[PDB]
Design a protein around this ligand. Sequence first.
Ligand SMILES: [Zn+2]
Ligand SMILES: [Zn+2]
Length: 81
Amino acid sequence: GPASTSETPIKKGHRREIGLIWNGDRVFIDRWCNPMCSKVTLGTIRARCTCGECPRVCEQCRTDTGVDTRIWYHNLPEIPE
Ligand SMILES: [Zn+2]
Ligand SMILES: [Zn+2]
């Protein structure tokens, strides 16, 4: 029924995050994709999906150039770019 434990299996995708940045007398919000497979953390953080099927693209990566060589694999070293 309604009132009942609602499991939560694998549901990859694209989930906007929030990485507030304390600078001056104002704050700045950062946009990106965990996308989801990675536990969202209060603050700018880029997790490397292990599935290798996402993030594949969206309204942020699609536009991105590196998206052409997007590494859905968490094999790469870092991101010097
Ligand atoms: Zn993923
Ligand atoms: Zn995305």
